[PDB]
Amino acid sequence: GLFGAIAGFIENGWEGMIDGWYGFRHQNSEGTGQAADLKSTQAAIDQINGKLNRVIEKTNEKFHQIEKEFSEVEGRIQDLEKYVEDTKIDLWSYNAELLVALENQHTIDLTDSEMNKLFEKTGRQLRENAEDMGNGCFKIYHKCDNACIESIRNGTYDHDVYRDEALNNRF
Amino acid sequence: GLFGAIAGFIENGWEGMIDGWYGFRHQNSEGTGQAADLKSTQAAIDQINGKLNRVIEKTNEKFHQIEKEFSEVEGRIQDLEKYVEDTKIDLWSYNAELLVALENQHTIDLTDSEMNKLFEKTGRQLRENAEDMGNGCFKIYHKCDNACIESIRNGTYDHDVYRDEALNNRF
Amino acid sequence: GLFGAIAGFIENGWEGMIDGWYGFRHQNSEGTGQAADLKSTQAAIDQINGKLNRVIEKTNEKFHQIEKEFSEVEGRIQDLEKYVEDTKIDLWSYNAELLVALENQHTIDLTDSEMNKLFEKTGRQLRENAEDMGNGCFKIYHKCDNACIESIRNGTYDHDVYRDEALNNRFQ
Amino acid sequence: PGATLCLGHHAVPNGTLVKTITDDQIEVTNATELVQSSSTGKICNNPHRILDGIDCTLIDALLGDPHCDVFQNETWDLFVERSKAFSNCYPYDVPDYASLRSLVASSGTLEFITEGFTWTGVTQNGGSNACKRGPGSGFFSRLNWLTKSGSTYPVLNVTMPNNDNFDKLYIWGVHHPSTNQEQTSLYVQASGRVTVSTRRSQQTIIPNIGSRPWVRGLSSRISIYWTIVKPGDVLVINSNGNLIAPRGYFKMRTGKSSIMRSDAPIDTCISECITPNGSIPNDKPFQNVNKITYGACPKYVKQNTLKLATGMRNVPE
Amino acid sequence: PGATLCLGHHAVPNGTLVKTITDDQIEVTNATELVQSSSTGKICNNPHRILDGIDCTLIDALLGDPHCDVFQNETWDLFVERSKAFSNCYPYDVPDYASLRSLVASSGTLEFITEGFTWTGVTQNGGSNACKRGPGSGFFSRLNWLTKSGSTYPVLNVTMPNNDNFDKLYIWGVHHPSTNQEQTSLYVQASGRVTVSTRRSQQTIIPNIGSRPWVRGLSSRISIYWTIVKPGDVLVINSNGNLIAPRGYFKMRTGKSSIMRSDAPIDTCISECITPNGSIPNDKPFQNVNKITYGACPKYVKQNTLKLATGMRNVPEK
Amino acid sequence: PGATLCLGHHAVPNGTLVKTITDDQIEVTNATELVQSSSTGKICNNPHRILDGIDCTLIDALLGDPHCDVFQNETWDLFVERSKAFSNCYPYDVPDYASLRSLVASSGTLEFITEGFTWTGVTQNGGSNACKRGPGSGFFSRLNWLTKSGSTYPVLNVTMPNNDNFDKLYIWGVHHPSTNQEQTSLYVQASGRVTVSTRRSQQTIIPNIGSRPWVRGLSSRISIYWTIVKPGDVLVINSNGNLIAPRGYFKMRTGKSSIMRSDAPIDTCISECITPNGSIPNDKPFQNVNKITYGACPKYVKQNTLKLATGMRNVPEK
Numbered sequence A, B: 001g002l003f004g005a006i007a008g009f010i011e012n013g014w015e016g017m018i019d020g021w022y023g024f025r026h027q028n029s030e031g032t033g034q035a036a037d038l039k040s041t042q043a044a045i046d047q048i049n050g051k052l053n054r055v056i057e058k059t060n061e062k063f064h065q066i067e068k069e070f071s072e073v074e075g076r077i078q079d080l081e082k083y084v085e086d087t088k089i090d091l092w093s094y095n096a097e098l099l100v101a102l103e104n105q106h107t108i109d110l111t112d113s114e115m116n117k118l119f120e121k122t123g124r125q126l127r128e129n130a131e132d133m134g135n136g137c138f139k140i141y142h143k144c145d146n147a148c149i150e151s152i153r154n155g156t157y158d159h160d161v162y163r164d165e166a167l168n169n170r171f
Numbered sequence C: 001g002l003f004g005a006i007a008g009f010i011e012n013g014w015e016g017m018i019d020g021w022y023g024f025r026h027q028n029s030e031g032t033g034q035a036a037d038l039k040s041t042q043a044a045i046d047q048i049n050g051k052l053n054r055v056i057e058k059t060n061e062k063f064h065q066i067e068k069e070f071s072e073v074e075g076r077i078q079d080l081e082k083y084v085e086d087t088k089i090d091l092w093s094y095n096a097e098l099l100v101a102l103e104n105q106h107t108i109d110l111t112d113s114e115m116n117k118l119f120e121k122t123g124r125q126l127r128e129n130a131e132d133m134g135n136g137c138f139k140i141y142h143k144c145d146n147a148c149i150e151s152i153r154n155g156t157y158d159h160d161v162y163r164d165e166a167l168n169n170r171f172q
Numbered sequence D: 001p002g003a004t005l006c007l008g009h010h011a012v013p014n015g016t017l018v019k020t021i022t023d024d025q026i027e028v029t030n031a032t033e034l035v036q037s038s039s040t041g042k043i044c045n046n047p048h049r050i051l052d053g054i055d056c057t058l059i060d061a062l063l064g065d066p067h068c069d070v071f072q073n074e075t076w077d078l079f080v081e082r083s084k085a086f087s088n089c090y091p092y093d094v095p096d097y098a099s100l101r102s103l104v105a106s107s108g109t110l111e112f113i114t115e116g117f118t119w120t121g122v123t124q125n126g127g128s129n130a131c132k133r134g135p136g137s138g139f140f141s142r143l144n145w146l147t148k149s150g151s152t153y154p155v156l157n158v159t160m161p162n163n164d165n166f167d168k169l170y171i172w173g174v175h176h177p178s179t180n181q182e183q184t185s186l187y188v189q190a191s192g193r194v195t196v197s198t199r200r201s202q203q204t205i206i207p208n209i210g211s212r213p214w215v216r217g218l219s220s221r222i223s224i225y226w227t228i229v230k231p232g233d234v235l236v237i238n239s240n241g242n243l244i245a246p247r248g249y250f251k252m253r254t255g256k257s258s259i260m261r262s263d264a265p266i267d268t269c270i271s272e273c274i275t276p277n278g279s280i281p282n283d284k285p286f287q288n289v290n291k292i293t294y295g296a297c298p299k300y301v302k303q304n305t306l307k308l309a310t311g312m313r314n315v316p317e
Numbered sequence E, F: 001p002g003a004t005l006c007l008g009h010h011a012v013p014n015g016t017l018v019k020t021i022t023d024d025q026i027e028v029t030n031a032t033e034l035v036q037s038s039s040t041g042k043i044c045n046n047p048h049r050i051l052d053g054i055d056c057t058l059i060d061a062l063l064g065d066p067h068c069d070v071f072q073n074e075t076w077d078l079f080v081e082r083s084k085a086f087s088n089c090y091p092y093d094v095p096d097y098a099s100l101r102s103l104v105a106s107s108g109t110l111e112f113i114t115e116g117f118t119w120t121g122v123t124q125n126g127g128s129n130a131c132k133r134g135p136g137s138g139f140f141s142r143l144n145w146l147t148k149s150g151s152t153y154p155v156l157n158v159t160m161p162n163n164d165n166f167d168k169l170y171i172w173g174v175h176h177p178s179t180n181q182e183q184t185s186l187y188v189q190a191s192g193r194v195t196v197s198t199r200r201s202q203q204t205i206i207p208n209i210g211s212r213p214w215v216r217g218l219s220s221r222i223s224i225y226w227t228i229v230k231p232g233d234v235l236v237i238n239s240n241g242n243l244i245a246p247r248g249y250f251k252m253r254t255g256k257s258s259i260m261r262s263d264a265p266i267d268t269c270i271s272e273c274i275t276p277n278g279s280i281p282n283d284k285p286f287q288n289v290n291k292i293t294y295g296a297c298p299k300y301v302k303q304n305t306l307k308l309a310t311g312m313r314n315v316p317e318k
């Protein structure tokens, strides 16, 4: 993808992440844990539902069509009826192929981008208290129990509380 | 947007920025201020004008047309004249809907990208003299009078001049 | 470009890089050097070959089509034959113009993206042992001979080996 | 002394292959099909008014072939013609059959109004054993085979004005006997003539004597013509032999009605989109069942599948 | 003992809703309209040569219906047909009327060249009170109603070669009497025939006798046919009755001329694009006024509006 | 004591200009062309079966104009008609010529099967010095000019059923003599009649006597008609004068055959795509050579060039 996260610095996805599209896994003094991130999940889901709703909007109704199968040879007028219909089908087949190609490229890029956005957001929340290990994981340089992790996941982590302990362990 | 700045880590736009599209607000010892960034603004305006000029480029001129209204029922070849014109109108209506959808998606993504580019550029000028606060703002860890702020805005800030003072306040 | 690397924080390209699309230039104690990065080069090339092969996928094949040049004035039926053909040619010309415009915009964006991706992967390999100088170059704060540089380029540089020396040079 | 916080995304064991701008095949977690490629095999009778022609073509129901007179005054959204349909009346041809079939189908109704034509000097209601109506010989219910009265066939010259506010459709015909004796024996004249005119249009037909292949016992033929009379215009029929006269007009309507050829059974269900293969759902934007459709329908494409990704790239390892 | 430097972008209290691939409606700071949906209601008389066929259709001006005589030798880029037009000459029909109307409209000129046809043995210049020219009887100005002379109507057999370097358009006709009495009184033969041919093509018409509805006093009719003769070819007319003869040819051109039905008045202004609703500007790429157009015009679409974003996403609040 | 590591990308002194959504001209390192705009000027004789008609049109080979009889029973994927083709037999016309030429071209074969028609009471095998076959007079090889035998021309009434499982194409004609003397001297009746019928179709032609432009010695004409007989149907021919009879049927096929007008010489080479200008390669997706094509061909567009970028933006200087 354009953003280098999915199938990039994130090595692989998580078949065990069942309750979200993106999320957090941690290991600390009390053990290991996992949680879906609902905002980034819902941002991807809303965008894909948007694209999916636009695709099935105005694709419909016609009543009088010309004849399209013929039981007798006739020459000129039948030749033009057939050429108009083959021309039309070729143009719509091309439209359908290109539409799905562009939509699919865009879906892969926007979901890659939401993964990257969540990573950057988390890194900004940790402010000198953590380092990017280069694989989508942060090494957190202070004691960080389940409540501390949960404060990171729910956006209320106060980096100043731990800055001194963390700077001391980093340097 | 794909880049996560506009309507992303930047909470909202500034109705008070009236002389540019992007820019800087600061707080220092001498007070608070606002200034537009000209280069980012002009980059976005030039791309949008470019796309607008391509859309209104070579359209138009005739070549002979068939009849499109009919005052008497005629059967087979009038049915074909109407089917040809309905098919053409439907294909052009589709082209126009998709052209505007793709173009608009791209204008939103490129303007978001210019915001993010200006943010990354400013962060790169500060070199350990600042920390990213997560909302589009830099905490600058040294005394930065108006001339120093303006040196950031015009790309002439020398980080070594302030590195020792800043490193001391950060750590 | 959307990603701000090519024609961005990387000021210009290297006419001297002749064996790759992306790569590294270094200065260390043993001198200066240049080396192409193969993974990023091949990633961009594979993507462009991919779109080129999709575009050149099997082309139309019709045998009997209508007549399209005429030797006599005839009126209504011939007017409709000509209008059908002018309409088709306009619609395909529009498709071809839009096809290459979109493809070209995207080719420029993915090559710009591969550049930015390579820069970020390198920065993540260096872990407090280097600082981003803002022009696509990293200042490395320890002695890094040719084998060390090579270990960065082939993805096996161990930042812990140099962390103490580098932190000591960065902050004191 | 620390902890590790890892960011990630989900994956599934087996995803779906989709196409992109750069890739013929790339695996995503989920996709949805955009091409409708299946049918139940049945035409749903709601919400469109389906008229099953069974043994009858629309033209035979229009003219009034006796085994088709069940369709008198019927209306339809979609008339369905079966391949088993057959004619069982006087052998006939329609020059520009396809156009007549098309304008009647588009009008959507066989509403017939009988008008009081006066055929002075001719025998009316001619019939044939090729066209039995019950046990006895007969004819199209909407046509009037006029023959000589006694031993003369005068010049017929009748008129019929349209004082209504809609268009009138007159269906009429010309008889082509196969021998000169038949011609004189029916229309005591060696060469017939039928001229049907309004104020702005006219048609004159001269019959042709000669043998054609035998159909239902007969080597003669009837030729079917039509004339539309708009409000304020006049119909004038002028003939000195061979006229197969109209008994009235059909009421012309405009709307969303059409006709389709199909052998698919009709069922009691709901479906907005009909194809000759049966009804199809119209939730997908494209379809591959048939280029012939009726109703609010997905657009026909040559592809039999087109997968739209609805999830991210699937990277299980 | 520090500073804060914040990055940002502008916003406005209310922007414009536009559509994207993902969103039916999303707000941006500014947008531009791509569909032309309004007209002045008037047809501008420059830069195209507009020709108003006030009471005259193009076919009646072609044949020479007397109240259309003002249009002789006229030219146009766009001929405009009014709904108030009427015929006031001999009742007629044109088989494949639309084709003749289209090829004459596309030719762009009614330039007529009178030729010296010799009709030996017949009376020329027949007329009718259905086609009055002044208070007296008359006929189409470009057609020649030939009838019996004395007591004979010979077999006409005339030829007319095209030695020029352009195509010639011949308009001719066949008379359909309402009675056998009429037929023999005008043409002594009891059943006529008109045969018009070039070296590689031919048309033969057989008249039709019978009563039709009265139009301007008449039950008889004329049917109009045309013939194009290319350089080097020749025209041959062969008839033994009922011929409505040509007086010459119309000169054929190729170009950008056409015809439109419209009741919009002509005005003094400049506009490259004409619709039956009036002139429209052609700066936008699409239009919603009429699928019928003439000139360099935006493409017709079903949408009445299409907004292209010309600014960023509008986020005045979180 | 440290080191600098710089990331970068390549560039070239001058690349290729390409178009984008934003930009009319932007420079990339490399691009490939998508519009085929040139031809070798020659039609390649492989892989499609090309049939050069040289001096013969398809219709003249169909009827059997003697100098076109070298084409009897020929088949083609593409019939190529030359502008130098000429007719050299009895002067004729084909109402709906284009349709006959089209259905024959699409059928791809001139396979002709002679059938045993019995023409009781007439002379067969009429000829003309307008249509020499060798030193002597002759006629189209596939048509049979029937005339009076002795002093009568009976009412012909023959039938020919189609018991095969393919469609039969019958080509027939009607003779239009130029004088009443001719009409009676060939056919006893003063006015001929030709009726050709199947179970569900019929057509009757009435000849028309009179002069047409003088062509290869004659002022009379033949008019060509055709009739398809489906399996189970039957052909019935009924005529009392002026019939130009069929000798058999052409066998109807369905397939990929067609016809093209071109003066391009044929060459021995390989190419799937043929235009009237010659063959063109079909590796590029679009072409600008001719809207007329045959085979697997790039789509025709109005642009003579369209460059697809195949490398990154070219930034050799700031």
Ligand SMILES: *[C@@H]1O[C@H](CO)[C@@H](O[C@@H]2O[C@H](CO)[C@@H](O[C@@H]3O[C@H](CO[C@H]4O[C@H](CO)[C@@H](O)[C@H](O)[C@@H]4O)[C@@H](O)[C@H](O)[C@@H]3O)[C@H](O)[C@H]2NC(C)=O)[C@H](O)[C@H]1NC(C)=O
Pocket: D211, D212, D213, D214, D219, F157, F158, F159, F234, F236
């Ligand atoms: C012009 O030529 C035409 C062709 O030669 C003549 O028409 C044929 O004339 C005979 C004599 O009247 C007809 O015979 C009748 O045909 C029916 C149908 O027979 C078919 O069906 C039965 C039952 O299924 C089957 O057993 C037969 O094999 C046939 O397949 C018979 O049933 C009647 O009794 C009677 O014999 C021909 O049918 C008729 N055919 C055609 C195609 O025209 C015509 O009479 C000639 N006209 C003149 C004026 O000479």
Ligand SMILES: *[C@@H]1O[C@H](CO)[C@@H](O[C@@H]2O[C@H](CO)[C@@H](O[C@@H]3O[C@H](CO)[C@@H](O)[C@H](O)[C@@H]3O)[C@H](O)[C@H]2NC(C)=O)[C@H](O)[C@H]1NC(C)=O
Pocket: D157, D158, D159, D234, D236, E211, E212, E213, E214, E215
């Ligand atoms: C065959 O029937 C038609 C129609 O029924 C006859 O046409 C009619 O002919 C009469 C007498 O010529 C026309 O009467 C005229 O009416 C006007 C008023 O509009 C009046 O001012 C005149 O003095 C004259 O009496 C009548 O309009 C006309 N009707 C139609 C519909 O055309 C025709 O005469 C009959 N043919 C024969 C040979 O009898």
Ligand SMILES: CCOC(=O)c1c(CSc2ccccc2)n(C)c2cc(Br)c(O)c(CN(C)C)c12
Pocket: A090, A091, A093, A094, A097, A098, A101, C054, C055, C056, C057, C060, D020, D021, D302, D303, F285, F299
């Ligand atoms: C320039 C010609 O483009 C195309 O015609 C198509 C092309 C090439 S253009 C393209 C490039 C990327 C993605 C989609 C289309 N592909 C791949 C098609 C795939 C299918 Br399935 C298809 O029906 C068509 C339509 N043909 C039959 C008219 C195309």
Ligand SMILES: CCOC(=O)c1c(CSc2ccccc2)n(C)c2cc(Br)c(O)c(CN(C)C)c12
Pocket: A054, A055, A056, A057, A058, A059, A060, B090, B091, B093, B094, B097, B098, B101, D285, E020, E021, E302, E303
């Ligand atoms: C899959 C094909 O669907 C479409 O054609 C359209 C579609 C669906 S495809 C699409 C998807 C995203 C963005 C734009 C178009 N929309 C939304 C239309 C909106 C308008 Br207004 C419109 O005129 C059409 C054209 N119809 C009338 C032929 C479409």
Ligand SMILES: CCOC(=O)c1c(CSc2ccccc2)n(C)c2cc(Br)c(O)c(CN(C)C)c12
Pocket: B054, B055, B056, B057, B058, B059, C090, C091, C093, C094, C097, C098, C101, E285, E286, E299, F020, F021, F302, F303
């Ligand atoms: C709304 C109409 O858009 C267009 O038609 C075209 C447009 C404008 S829309 C567009 C925008 C970006 C990229 C490509 C097309 N351009 C630039 C064309 C360039 C060429 Br070359 C061309 O043949 C056409 C097709 N014309 C002949 C029908 C267009």
Ligand SMILES: *[C@@H]1O[C@H](CO)[C@@H](O[C@@H]2O[C@H](CO)[C@@H](O)[C@H](O)[C@H]2NC(C)=O)[C@H](O)[C@H]1NC(C)=O
Pocket: A146, A147, A148, A150, A151, A154, A156
């Ligand atoms: C974010 O998570 C933290 C940690 O779980 C929440 O803070 C604690 O919440 C629990 C349960 O409500 C209390 O028992 C603790 O006393 C809280 N600790 C502190 C320091 O407040 C916090 O409420 C969460 N915030 C949001 C917005 O969900």
Ligand SMILES: *[C@@H]1O[C@H](CO)[C@@H](O[C@@H]2O[C@H](CO)[C@@H](O)[C@H](O)[C@H]2NC(C)=O)[C@H](O)[C@H]1NC(C)=O
Pocket: A052, D030, D031, D032, D310
């Ligand atoms: C794969 O994607 C499809 C489409 O987004 C999902 O199908 C939808 O399912 C919901 C609830 O199950 C329905 O309300 C929608 O109407 C469905 N849409 C369509 C187009 O069918 C499907 O659930 C997804 N599958 C997985 C495993 O996530």
Ligand SMILES: *[C@@H]1O[C@H](CO)[C@@H](O[C@@H]2O[C@H](CO)[C@@H](O)[C@H](O)[C@H]2NC(C)=O)[C@H](O)[C@H]1NC(C)=O
Pocket: D073, D111, D112, D113, D251
């Ligand atoms: C067939 O339908 C037509 C039109 O619906 C019938 O004619 C109408 O009959 C109704 C009721 O008898 C009258 O109120 C209308 O005035 C008639 N219309 C006209 C134009 O006269 C006709 O009677 C129907 N025939 C049958 C057998 O049902």
Ligand SMILES: *[C@@H]1O[C@H](CO)[C@@H](O[C@@H]2O[C@H](CO)[C@@H](O)[C@H](O)[C@H]2NC(C)=O)[C@H](O)[C@H]1NC(C)=O
Pocket: A069, D037, D038, D039, D276, D277, D288, D289, D290
């Ligand atoms: C729908 O019906 C059509 C017509 O019966 C089918 O198309 C035919 O399919 C057969 C079998 O593959 C082919 O031999 C014919 O050439 C096809 N004819 C045409 C005109 O396409 C079609 O396959 C049916 N589809 C479904 C889903 O029932």
Ligand SMILES: *[C@@H]1O[C@H](CO)[C@@H](O[C@@H]2O[C@H](CO)[C@@H](O)[C@H](O)[C@H]2NC(C)=O)[C@H](O)[C@H]1NC(C)=O
Pocket: E037, E038, E039, E276, E277, E288, E289, E290
């Ligand atoms: C331009 O003129 C056309 C034709 O008069 C208008 O289209 C008609 O609009 C009325 C009322 O909306 C409908 O009843 C007709 O059915 C329409 N006709 C057609 C052929 O669509 C059109 O509205 C006019 N447009 C403008 C902008 O004035």
Ligand SMILES: *[C@@H]1O[C@H](CO)[C@@H](O[C@@H]2O[C@H](CO)[C@@H](O)[C@H](O)[C@H]2NC(C)=O)[C@H](O)[C@H]1NC(C)=O
Pocket: C069, F037, F038, F039, F276, F277, F288, F289, F290
């Ligand atoms: C292929 O042949 C066609 C037809 O001979 C050429 O088109 C003609 O080109 C000349 C000069 O460019 C024009 O004056 C004619 O009006 C064109 N005719 C038509 C019907 O368009 C075409 O240029 C040739 N192409 C090549 C590559 O040789």
Ligand SMILES: *[C@@H]1O[C@H](CO)[C@@H](O)[C@H](O)[C@H]1NC(C)=O
Pocket: B146, B147, B148, B149, B150, B151, B154, B156
């Ligand atoms: C940048 O701003 C400083 C003021 O802080 C000024 O002295 C300097 O000249 C400016 N440089 C440019 C290139 O504008």
Ligand SMILES: *[C@@H]1O[C@H](CO)[C@@H](O)[C@H](O)[C@H]1NC(C)=O
Pocket: C146, C147, C148, C150, C151, C154, C156
């Ligand atoms: C990477 O480079 C180092 C130093 O040159 C070398 O020792 C090592 O084997 C290389 N590893 C790979 C995988 O190429």
Ligand SMILES: *[C@@H]1O[C@H](CO)[C@@H](O)[C@H](O)[C@H]1NC(C)=O
Pocket: E030, E031, E032, E310
């Ligand atoms: C909106 O965009 C158009 C086109 O670029 C421009 O002319 C107009 O001034 C803009 N409006 C505002 C309020 O900026």
Ligand SMILES: *[C@@H]1O[C@H](CO)[C@@H](O)[C@H](O)[C@H]1NC(C)=O
Pocket: E072, E073, E111, E112, E113
């Ligand atoms: C029409 O033009 C021709 C030639 O240009 C001329 O001879 C003729 O007199 C003109 N007729 C009128 C009525 O001006």
Ligand SMILES: *[C@@H]1O[C@H](CO)[C@@H](O)[C@H](O)[C@H]1NC(C)=O
Pocket: F013, F014, F015, F316
């Ligand atoms: C390449 O050459 C063109 C002239 O065709 C010139 O306009 C362009 O600026 C050149 N590019 C560079 C990078 O010098």
